[PDB]
Amino acid sequence: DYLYFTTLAEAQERMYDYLAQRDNVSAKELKNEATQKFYRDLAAKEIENGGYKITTTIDQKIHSAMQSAVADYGYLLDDGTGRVEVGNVLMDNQTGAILGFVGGRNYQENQNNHAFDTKRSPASTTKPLLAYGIAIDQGLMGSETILSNYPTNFANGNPIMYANSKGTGMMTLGEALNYSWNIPAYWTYRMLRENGVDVKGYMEKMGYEIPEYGIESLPMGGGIEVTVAQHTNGYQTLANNGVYHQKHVISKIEAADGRVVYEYQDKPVQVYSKATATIMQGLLREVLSSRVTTTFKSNLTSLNPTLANADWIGKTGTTGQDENMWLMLSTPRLTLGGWIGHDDNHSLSQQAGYSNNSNYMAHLVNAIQQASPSIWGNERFALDPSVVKSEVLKSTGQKPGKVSVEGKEVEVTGSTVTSYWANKSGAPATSYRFAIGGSDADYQNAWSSIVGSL
Ligand SMILES: *C(=O)[C@@H](NC(=O)[C@@H](Cc1ccccc1)NC(=O)CCCCCN=[N+]=[N-])[C@@H](C)O
Ligand SMILES: [Cl-]
Ligand SMILES: [Cl-]
Ligand SMILES: [Cl-]
Ligand SMILES: [Cl-]
Ligand SMILES: [Cl-]
Ligand SMILES: [Cl-]
Ligand SMILES: [Cl-]
Ligand SMILES: [Cl-]
Ligand SMILES: [Cl-]
Ligand SMILES: [Cl-]
Ligand SMILES: [Cl-]
Ligand SMILES: [Cl-]
Ligand SMILES: [Cl-]
Ligand SMILES: [Cl-]
Ligand SMILES: [Cl-]
């Protein structure tokens, strides 16, 4: 099944490296196609014939429960666009160990591995990692920072859309994330580009391969295609207080006589500050609780109300013609990545991600807990002590003070809120351009509203 061939493939690659080094083959000799073919064949025969012991990270009872879950409840994905395919990876947040996965609906009917082999755009699930997370890490925004959702066009002249909406006005990062509005994400990434932020440094530390970082739609998964396993590794980094661990299924290969062919080496990397990661956890908690883009919390509360009270955080994504739906879920202990789509890339139904995948993943999470009752954990995500708390205006997301609006030095006061920052000084004083993004026209309209309220 999917586990046998995934494990065999990874074991073969590790045996290939071992045999090449053992036989003292140069990096140069390894470039020779005939020599590579020989060493791949020799690696295969060594596993096939050799009596090696392959130790995996797979929790057999959990992985078996995930297979029974997709057998029993996979039909909940079928939405009247034909048989819907599925991939899921369950990952330990502290180690990057893969405890279990779903390769697809039924290996016997379709062998394609939707957990490790198929690459699709992660759509709006890019936003927390590539846009908001990095902006917070760089001290360019906090939890109650304001972004423009005013209408704006891509560089090709097309309006940036959210279903049938061309946009609204100013909104908090929280509203931007809960709805997954697109314009605020676009302005956030544009701000990173304008400031020359090394985005590629963050994404490559987490093992992402992105060919062009200049794509305006990058935060909406434009110019990005990822496996479920890889993308699960990104959400592992946010959930593990910003510390990446490389995903792995193989922990060790030993000869019969106990000689170590290969052993996984942990190389932890602080990709985001603890402040940034713990701020993002708080925002992604509200994405699921708000139930705007996913019914997941309603589905899970009904199936398993005790498990629904674990500290769930998550994010959804939908490609533009509903070809791909994503739901990424974490507790402090585990991350579960979920993709659905069609092997030939044709459209799912409009609600496939909102309802069907949410319901299926609620069943999958319940099946994992039933197989291993403590595995999700009862720990809460919590703000790191290094987080800076700023009292800011609800209206501007910046500290109270004086601003020049149309000549007249205006005293900006009103309702305040605590904003969480990952810098030293926290939020600055209100400036005229108080938000991420927006045109001179947008700001005229915004300030009109704010002055009216004083
Ligand atoms: C999040 O999921 C948002 N949608 C997307 O991110 C979609 C559509 C989109 C793109 C740019 C600006 C606004 C909306 N992203 C997307 O389709 C990118 C991947 C395209 C790759 C081509 N192959 N395919 N499929 C929701 C909330 O609007
Ligand atoms: Cl399997
Ligand atoms: Cl496979
Ligand atoms: Cl040999
Ligand atoms: Cl086991
Ligand atoms: Cl992968
Ligand atoms: Cl795609
Ligand atoms: Cl524009
Ligand atoms: Cl909201
Ligand atoms: Cl970059
Ligand atoms: Cl990648
Ligand atoms: Cl670039
Ligand atoms: Cl572009
Ligand atoms: Cl591996
Ligand atoms: Cl892997
Ligand atoms: Cl041996």
Ligand SMILES: [Cl-]
């Ligand atoms: Cl830190």
Ligand SMILES: [Cl-]
């Ligand atoms: Cl809730």
Ligand SMILES: [Cl-]
């Ligand atoms: Cl609901």
Ligand SMILES: [Cl-]
């Ligand atoms: Cl979405």
Ligand SMILES: [Cl-]
């Ligand atoms: Cl298909």
Ligand SMILES: [Cl-]
């Ligand atoms: Cl706790």
Ligand SMILES: [Cl-]
């Ligand atoms: Cl907290």
Ligand SMILES: [Cl-]
């Ligand atoms: Cl503080």
Ligand SMILES: [Cl-]
């Ligand atoms: Cl303050």
Ligand SMILES: [Cl-]
């Ligand atoms: Cl600072």
Ligand SMILES: [Cl-]
């Ligand atoms: Cl800006």
Ligand SMILES: [Cl-]
């Ligand atoms: Cl303008």
